[PDB]
Amino acid sequence: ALFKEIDVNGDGAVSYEEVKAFVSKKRAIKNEQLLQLIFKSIDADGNGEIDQNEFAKFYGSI
Amino acid sequence: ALFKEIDVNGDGAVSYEEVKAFVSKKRAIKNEQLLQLIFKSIDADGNGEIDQNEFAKFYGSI
Amino acid sequence: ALFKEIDVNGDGAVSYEEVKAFVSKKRAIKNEQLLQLIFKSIDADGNGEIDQNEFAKFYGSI
Ligand SMILES: [Ba+2]
Ligand SMILES: [Ba+2]
Ligand SMILES: [Ba+2]
Ligand SMILES: [Ba+2]
Ligand SMILES: [Ba+2]
Ligand SMILES: [Ba+2]
Ligand SMILES: [Ba+2]
Ligand SMILES: [Ba+2]
Ligand SMILES: [Ba+2]
């Protein structure tokens, strides 16, 4: 449950400092998750890296 | 006065480095201030922490 | 070329870690570049710093 994720110390309470620590790491993730998506959207062969011809395709008109 | 806040060293000038340091800490505050607001909006008893039943209320439909 | 900027190590590939490092430093720049613009927009004499009377002008109605 979401509460148990935030209430890190596990004492049934969520301190401000904890909410804050969560609120941020939540945001910190759809960043990593979006970028990853954007990435693999470019890396076609899922080989781990983008070469010139993938980067080439990705950009431009038509 | 706002100028005296930014011109930290107090020499009548505001360097870029200072504006920058201010511009950021200004932003750094409505973050803390908004979240705090959001927080105490959830913590009903203002006891310092949110328990399950407050978190319970906060979320959901109806 | 943009690719050579990102592919820092210069091995023809762009790792995620690199894209990420780029994506951020790109963003990190229009920040510095916008603020600088805003700054020199205030510093009229381009002397390096804003005095009271420039800051005075900058603010307000009429
Ligand atoms: Ba706790
Ligand atoms: Ba893929
Ligand atoms: Ba590839
Ligand atoms: Ba100064
Ligand atoms: Ba309250
Ligand atoms: Ba409470
Ligand atoms: Ba590389
Ligand atoms: Ba100027
Ligand atoms: Ba000046």
Author numbering:
A (entry chain A), B (entry chain A), C (entry chain A): 4 to 65
Quote the passages of the study that discuss this structure, keeping the authors' original sentences.
EhCaBP1 has four EF-hand motifs, each of them able to bind one calcium ion similar to that of calmodulin. The overall structure is trimeric in which EF-hand 1 of one molecule interacts with EF-hand 2 of the other molecule in a domain swapped manner to form an assembled domain similar to that of the calmodulin N-terminal domain. Thermodynamic studies confirm that EhCaBP1 has five binding sites for Ba2+ compared to four binding sites for the other metals. These structures and thermodynamic studies reveal that the EF-hand motifs can accommodate several heavy atoms with similar binding affinities.
In CaM, Ba2+ has low binding affinity for EF-hand motifs compared to Ca2+ For EhCaBP1 also, Ba2+ has lower binding energy compared to Ca2+, even though the difference in binding energy is not very high, therefore it cannot replace the calcium at low concentrations. Hence, the EhCaBP1 was denatured and refolded in Ba2+ containing buffer. The overall structure of the Ba2+-EhCaBP1 complex, including the coordination geometry, is similar to that seen in the native structure, except for a couple of features The coordination distances in the EF1 motif are on average 0.1 Å longer in Ba2+-EhCaBP1 than in the Ca2+-bound structure. This difference suggests that the EF-hand motif is flexible enough to accommodate metal ions of varied size. Both barium ions in the EF2 motif seem to be partially occupied, according to analyses of temperature factors and difference Fourier peaks. Before placing the heavy atoms, the fully occupied barium ion site had difference Fourier electron density at about 10σ and partially occupied barium ions has about 5σ level, clearly indicating the occupancy level. Our work has also provided the first successful example of replacing Ca2+ with Ba2+ in the EF1 motif of a calcium binding protein.
